[PDB]
Every structure is written in structure tokens, then in C-alpha cells.
Amino acid sequence: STIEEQAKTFLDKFNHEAEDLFYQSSLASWNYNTNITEENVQNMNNAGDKWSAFLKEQSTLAQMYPLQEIQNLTVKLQLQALQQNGSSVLSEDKSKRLNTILNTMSTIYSTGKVCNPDNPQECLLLEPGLNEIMANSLDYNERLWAWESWRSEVGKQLRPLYEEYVVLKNEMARANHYEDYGDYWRGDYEVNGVDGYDYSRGQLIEDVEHTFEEIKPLYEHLHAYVRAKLMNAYPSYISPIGCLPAHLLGDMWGRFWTNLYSLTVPFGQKPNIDVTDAMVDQAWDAQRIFKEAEKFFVSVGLPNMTQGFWENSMLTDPGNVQKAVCHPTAWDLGKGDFRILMCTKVTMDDFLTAHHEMGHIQYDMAYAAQPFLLRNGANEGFHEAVGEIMSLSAATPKHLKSIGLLSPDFQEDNETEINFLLKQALTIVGTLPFTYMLEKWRWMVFKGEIPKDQWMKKWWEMKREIVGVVEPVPHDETYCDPASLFHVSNDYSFIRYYTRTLYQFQFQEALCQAAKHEGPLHKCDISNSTEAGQKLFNMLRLGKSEPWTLALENVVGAKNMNVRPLLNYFEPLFTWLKDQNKNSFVGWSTDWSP
Amino acid sequence: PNITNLCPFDEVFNATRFASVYAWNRKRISNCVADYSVLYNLAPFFTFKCYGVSPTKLNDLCFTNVYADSFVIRGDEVRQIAPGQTGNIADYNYKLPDDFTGCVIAWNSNKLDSKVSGNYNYLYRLFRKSNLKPFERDISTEIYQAGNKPCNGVAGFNCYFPLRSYSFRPTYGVGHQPYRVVVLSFELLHAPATVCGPKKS
Numbered sequence A: 001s002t003i004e005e006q007a008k009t010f011l012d013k014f015n016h017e018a019e020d021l022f023y024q025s026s027l028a029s030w031n032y033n034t035n036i037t038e039e040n041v042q043n044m045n046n047a048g049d050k051w052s053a054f055l056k057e058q059s060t061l062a063q064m065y066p067l068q069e070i071q072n073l074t075v076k077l078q079l080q081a082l083q084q085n086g087s088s089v090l091s092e093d094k095s096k097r098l099n100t101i102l103n104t105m106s107t108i109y110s111t112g113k114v115c116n117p118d119n120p121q122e123c124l125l126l127e128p129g130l131n132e133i134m135a136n137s138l139d140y141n142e143r144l145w146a147w148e149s150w151r152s153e154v155g156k157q158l159r160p161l162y163e164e165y166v167v168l169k170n171e172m173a174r175a176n177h178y179e180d181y182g183d184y185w186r187g188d189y190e191v192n193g194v195d196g197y198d199y200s201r202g203q204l205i206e207d208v209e210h211t212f213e214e215i216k217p218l219y220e221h222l223h224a225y226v227r228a229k230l231m232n233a234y235p236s237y238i239s240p241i242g243c244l245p246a247h248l249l250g251d252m253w254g255r256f257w258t259n260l261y262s263l264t265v266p267f268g269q270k271p272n273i274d275v276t277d278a279m280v281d282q283a284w285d286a287q288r289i290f291k292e293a294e295k296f297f298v299s300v301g302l303p304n305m306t307q308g309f310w311e312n313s314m315l316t317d318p319g320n321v322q323k324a325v326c327h328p329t330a331w332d333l334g335k336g337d338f339r340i341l342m343c344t345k346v347t348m349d350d351f352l353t354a355h356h357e358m359g360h361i362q363y364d365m366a367y368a369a370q371p372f373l374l375r376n377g378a379n380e381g382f383h384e385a386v387g388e389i390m391s392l393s394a395a396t397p398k399h400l401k402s403i404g405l406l407s408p409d410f411q412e413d414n415e416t417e418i419n420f421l422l423k424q425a426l427t428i429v430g431t432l433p434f435t436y437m438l439e440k441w442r443w444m445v446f447k448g449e450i451p452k453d454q455w456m457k458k459w460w461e462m463k464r465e466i467v468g469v470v471e472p473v474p475h476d477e478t479y480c481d482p483a484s485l486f487h488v489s490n491d492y493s494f495i496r497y498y499t500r501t502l503y504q505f506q507f508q509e510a511l512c513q514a515a516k517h518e519g520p521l522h523k524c525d526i527s528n529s530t531e532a533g534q535k536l537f538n539m540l541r542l543g544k545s546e547p548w549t550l551a552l553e554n555v556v557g558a559k560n561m562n563v564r565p566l567l568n569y570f571e572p573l574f575t576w577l578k579d580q581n582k583n584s585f586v587g588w589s590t591d592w593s594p
Numbered sequence B: 001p002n003i004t005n006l007c008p009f010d011e012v013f014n015a016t017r018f019a020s021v022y023a024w025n026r027k028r029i030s031n032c033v034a035d036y037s038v039l040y041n042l043a044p045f046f047t048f049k050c051y052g053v054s055p056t057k058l059n060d061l062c063f064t065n066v067y068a069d070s071f072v073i074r075g076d077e078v079r080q081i082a083p084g085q086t087g088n089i090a091d092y093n094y095k096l097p098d099d100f101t102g103c104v105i106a107w108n109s110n111k112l113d114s115k116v117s118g119n120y121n122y123l124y125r126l127f128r129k130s131n132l133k134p135f136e137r138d139i140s141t142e143i144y145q146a147g148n149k150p151c152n153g154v155a156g157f158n159c160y161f162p163l164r165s166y167s168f169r170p171t172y173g174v175g176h177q178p179y180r181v182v183v184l185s186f187e188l189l190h191a192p193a194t195v196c197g198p199k200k201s
């Protein structure tokens, strides 16, 4: 026939072989993660080499079939995904240069150490010592000392190294007919071939900035409220009209706002909900936690999870005989194998993370019927949101009342709603602008349209005019401050956080409106609603065979990102702030200078 | 009937090593012990699917000529054995006519086939010509020409090897564990008719 049947049979053979090899490599990786040995490291290297060689050979084999005369869609999508060789276009010299430069990134971050002069022989690493000296203190002198010292010797080492990295990335983009590496990152949101569902690589920046422009007033008001709280608390150092310097944000680089919760609560006398006391007084363990989690999931409507998990799981750390990392993760193995690796501790956040990982496993289990290539989410944002839906839903006091943990003696009023919404707002609206800022910065620096010799000055100005944070001390052009983050050093996409935050609220509104659970938005319980589960699964089954817009249409009915659910969630808190903080100064002055 | 004139036809339900799917093993039964109520009482066997005639009244009609069939497949395709479904195995490895009258038995082999290193001794045909005839066996491994083009059975491109290899392991979940399958069929009245069992009047 034509090349259509050729592509079909080749894809069948590739599906089989890739399935087998991927299963081998993933099982080896799981075995290493459970128990760490040097021979396991050698096995890791061998499996990685085999997978890389197989992918290279199969991509070179697939490059024969052109995409011009293919009329199907799934076959075209698979061929488009597979045909892209990746880094093979570059010569071996620059290929190994890139490998070594990523190795330098990993070494300077993981093994990067700034050591206290008090104990030069036994001191703290980037974690957890820096975090506990930056977010668990009151004196400002050591705070500013650490703030200056962290980049006093780390930023210097990487600026020429980062320049080499960015020029090599520009060559990488040029080799594959891409305008910039930012286009390479944005390509995950690109879909073509469908009329009315077309999404280009340009509209993303415009609609993201439009959403941020819509959300700006709430963030401004919350920042003004926190600044007023700081002035009423500790005015001896910060000028009453000046902006908020970053070193007072608790985190070393200024990412989250949760750790300021000790100096933000308006309702100090009101006790926040804490189920840990009843959790320990009733002898709760990980097994019962996951049992009730799967009971909740089957209450929603999704099927019970595999039995082979239970006899092939590691939930409780088996003493100290063997040493292994217990960082909570959900592993997809293939061939009907899914696993969870986490060390169970008795705390509410562990409960929420257990729900999160169970949701992740559910989403992974959903699209097992799809072929091997199409076994992924519609984009890089669906996983986190579809996992965090249950985490957001299970934190309501109504759910705790229903499950039987909290005593029904607790009354529900406006005060608890205000406290809960304050916590959630500090979690969300404090990290949305930072994410947008970092992603936009990396976007126009990888496009290469901006000059070179005053990057720090421009970056500080455009931070001050947007996020309203002023530097404590001037920085020269040799510094490389935005490289202190883990993600920027290891080439990770940072835009998935904005998308996750918007999409989770879209999902919550669209799944509680159909749930007919009348009341406030934050008091929505997904459990005992089979129709909501079916509505979720009618899209959660697709995977990535269809455009992400078609996916978002099937559960929400909207074709893009919208801020309205997010504004609806914070409606009570927004009303409280507007009614109470009218007498306080709002906004950041544009004339302040340190 | 006597019947202590046993014949070794119960070994196919309790064996040591099953064959592949392309070389499915065909057997003839005559003048034997026709005991079949014992088979229904065997708990470990799980999938008891009959389509031709009545299962509980399978012993009612005397079996003049009996054919037994044995092979092993993957967990998902036990549903594809039922007549009227197309795809792999059902069209490239083994065929069952719609008018076929008989029964099919399937059971688990999790602990009798697994291996920590992965079992690769079971193969299956993935490519074939237009179709295999019902109740026919194909063994030859002639290099499959693919579609068109002058690729005269060499290697590598376009042309593909028809017989691929399975992989079975202990850590697999339900849906990838090996399933041992046997088939029972019969035909009527040609050469002086031989066997039927517990017609307990």
C-alpha cells in the first residue's frame, strides 16, 4: 500500500519493543530506589545506555516516513513525537560539552556548600541549615548577611558558565529550526490540524499576561495587608512607606509565603483545626490512611486500585537496617504495575500528600489502554491539578466531620472560613506572581532579544515595578542571582505551576457546580457524587490523544485559562480585606529608593 | 462402559510445559473415559466459557469424535478467543469459526511460569498474510514482505520478522500474567462411534 500501513506496522513493533525495554529500566530504577548499592548504580548506567541507544536507533529509523501524506491523526501525533531525535543534531564535541555542563550544574547545586565560619569542619549545606537560619529568626543583621553571602560566591562562578550554556542552547535551537529554546519549551502547548481548536506558540504569553493583569489587584491588596501587619509588628527597621525587601519573605530566594504565617493571623485567639491529637489518640497508621483514601476514591466513583500494589508496596520504613530515600513519589512501571514510595509520618500535610499521590496513581492508571507513546497527560499541567483536586477537597472541615476523626463539637462560622482562606491565599497568590516572573524572565533571556551588560539592573527594575520587592543592597553585573533556584539550574519547565493553579480551580468549580453541593466554594465535597466522577473520567481517560483544549472542554466547558474560579475561591477573603483594610495604605510607592 | 479403560487425556489439564500459540497442540480422543463432571468440580480452573452447546448438558450428547487443543496466551486476549472478534491472535495466530461448537477453558499460571530474569521462551506470530483459515496451523517463518517495494527478504527496513517473543515475570499485574488455555470440540458420526460416559439412567 502507501506508507500508512508501513507506519502502522512499524509503530506496532516499536510499541512492543519500547514497552519491554521501558519496563526493564523502570523496574531496575525502582530496585535501586528501594536499596542503594554501587552495583545498582552500574545497573542504572547500563539500563540508561540501552534506553538511549534504542531511542536513537528507533528515531533514526522513523525519520524515513515523511509527514506530508499522512491523513490519520493518532499516527501523525505518534510520528511527530518519535521523529524528533533531540540532541543528536549537535556534533559529539558539543554534545559531550552539554553533558559535562549539566554535570557541572548538578555538582555545583547538590554538592554546593556555603560553610559557617564558626564550624568550618562540620557545618550546614543548602538544606536544611540555610532554610532554618533564614526562616526561623528575628534579627535582621544575620538575615541580610546570609542573603548577601549566599550569592557572594555562587553567582560569580556561574555567570560565564551560564553564558556558555545559553549560547550552546541558542545553537541547539538554531539546529532544529526553532527561534529560541523558549519556543522549544512552549512547544508542549502547540496543537495543529484541528479547525477551531488551533493553538499557536504565541498566544500563550498574551493570555498568561492577561490573566496576571486580571489577578493583580488581589495580590496587591494582600501584599499591602501583609506589609501593614509587618509595620504594626516590627517597624524599627523597615521604612513605613518603603516596599518589602525579599529577605523578609522567609524563603532564601523568595518563593512561598507560608512560613510568615506566625505573623499574619488576624484571629490569634481562634485555634486552627488540628486532627493530629485525635490521629494519635486513636492509633492511626499508614495502612488505615490508605484504606480510607481508597474508600473515598471509590465513593467518588473511580474504581478500586490494584491488589498487586498491597503486596508490592513500601509504606512504612523497615527500621534502619537498610538506608533509602523516603521522599514521597508515585512510580509508574507499566504492564499493570504501579507503586508508591513514601515514609509515613503522623501529620496532616502527610495526609494531604498521601491523597495527592493516590490521585497521581489514579491518573497514571487511567490511560493504560492507550498505546505506549500516548501514555501521558494532555500537557505538563494536568497531572499536578488532577492530583491536587482531592488534596483541596479533603481539607474541608465537613469531610473531617464525615470521616469520624474530628468531634462534631466543632461549630462552623465565618472565623474558620477566614482562617482557612488566609492560609490558602498565602499558599497560592504569593507564588503565582513569582512563577510568572521567573518564567517571563527566562523567556525573554532565552529569546536573546535583550542586551547583556546591565541584566541585573533591568531585572531589579522590572521586579520592582511588577512584584513590588526592592533589593537590600546594590548588585553589580557579575552576579547571576536568578540562577539560585533548583529548577533553573537543571533545565526544568517552570510554567506548569501557573497552569496547575488555574486548572485546579477550574476543575473544582466545574465539578462542584455539577455536584449540586450548594454553599460556599470551599465547602465542596466530591465524595458521594457518581456523576462528577463520570464527568471527570470522560476526559481523564483520554491521556493525550486529543488536544488539551478538547480535554478541558469536556469537564469545564471553557477553551482556555480563566481567572474567575480563582477569584470566586477567595471571594470571602477578598470581601474581608476590602471591608477591613480600607484604612490601611495600599499599593507600593514607585518613588522609594533604598 | 466399564470404565477403567483410561486414556491419557487428563494430562492436558495438568502438565509440565505448555506450547506456544502458533504451534497450538491438536489432539484426538476416542474409545476413552468420558468423565466431564469432574472437570467442572476443579476449583483452580477459572474461565469456563461455552458457546456451542449447553455446559451442564454437555455430557447428554455422546461424543463420537473429540478434539482437544492446548496453548498459552496473555491475560487480555482470553476475551478475544470468543468467536466474532478480530485483531491479533484471533486473526494472525489462531482462528475459531462462528459456527464452532465446543468449549474453552482458561486458568492462571502465575507461579508456574514466572522467573526473576524474565521468561522469553514463548513466542507468537505478529505478522501474516491476508488471513489464516479457521482451524489451521501456521509454523513457517518466511520473512514477511511489508506492503510493497523490492525488499526481497533481507533484513532491517520495511521487512519485519513475524515471530516476536513474549516476556513474563512475577511482578506483572493482572492483564499481563500468562494464561493457560485449552479448547474442547467434537464432530459427529463417521467411523464406528466410540465414547460417551455417565449416562446415569
Ligand SMILES: *[C@@H]1O[C@H](CO)[C@@H](O)[C@H](O)[C@H]1NC(C)=O
Residues within 6 Å of the ligand: A035, A036, A037, A322
Ligand atoms: C540491601 O542492600 C544491603 C547491602 O547490599 C543488603 O545487606 C541488604 O540485605 C539489602 N536488603 C534488601 C531488602 O534487599
Ligand SMILES: *[C@@H]1O[C@H](CO)[C@@H](O)[C@H](O)[C@H]1NC(C)=O
Residues within 6 Å of the ligand: A071, A072, A073, A074, A075
Ligand atoms: C487512525 O487509525 C486508527 C487505527 O486503529 C483508526 O482506529 C482510526 O479510525 C484512524 N483515523 C483516521 C482519521 O484515519
Ligand SMILES: *[C@@H]1O[C@H](CO)[C@@H](O)[C@H](O)[C@H]1NC(C)=O
Residues within 6 Å of the ligand: A295, A298, A304, A305, A306, A307
Ligand atoms: C474494591 O473496592 C472496594 C470498595 O468499593 C474495596 O473495599 C476493596 O478493597 C477493593 N478491592 C480490593 C482488592 O482492594
Ligand SMILES: *[C@@H]1O[C@H](CO)[C@@H](O)[C@H](O)[C@H]1NC(C)=O
Residues within 6 Å of the ligand: A299, A399, A402, A525, A527, A528
Ligand atoms: C457519603 O456516603 C457514606 C455512605 O453512607 C456516608 O457514610 C458518608 O457520611 C457520606 N459523606 C458525605 C459527605 O455525604
Ligand SMILES: *[C@@H]1O[C@H](CO)[C@@H](O)[C@H](O)[C@H]1NC(C)=O
Residues within 6 Å of the ligand: B010, B013, B014, B042, B043, B044, B045
Ligand atoms: C492436576 O491438577 C488438578 C487441579 O485441580 C487436579 O484436579 C488433577 O487431579 C491434577 N492431575 C492429576 C493427574 O492428579
